[PDB]
Structure formats: structure tokens, C-alpha cells
Symmetry: none
Subunit: 23 residues, 3 copies
């Protein structure tokens, strides 16, 4: 038997870093 | 007959920085 | 048959939170 299909995409990455201080 | 599907892939990367905060 | 390979990476996560007040 041949290999199965690839699994599905993994989960989304975490939130990004906080933005910078305001003006 | 094909084997079973592979596992889920790795997590994606972190998102981009948030926006600047408000002026002081 | 053997198992398939791992899937691709997930999408990037969302933008982080706003920075602090200036």
C-alpha cells in the first residue's frame, strides 16, 4: 500500500507582540 | 490501499505587532 | 500503506494588542 495523504494544516500561530507606545 | 492521512502540520508563526497605543 | 506526511504550517496568528499610551 502507498502512503496516505498529507495531514491538514496545523493550527494558527499565536498573537503577535504588543505594538509600540503611542505619541 | 493507502495508509491513513499524516498528522496536522506545525503551528503557524506569531502574528504581526499590534498598532501603536494612544497618544499620552 | 504507511501514514502520510505532516500537513503544512498553520496560518500566522492575529496581530498583537495595541502598545501602551505614549
Amino acid at each position: 500500500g502507498p502512503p496516505g495523504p498529507p495531514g491538514p494544516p496545523g493550527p494558527p500561530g499565536p498573537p503577535g507582540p504588543p505594538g509600540p507606545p503611542g505619541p
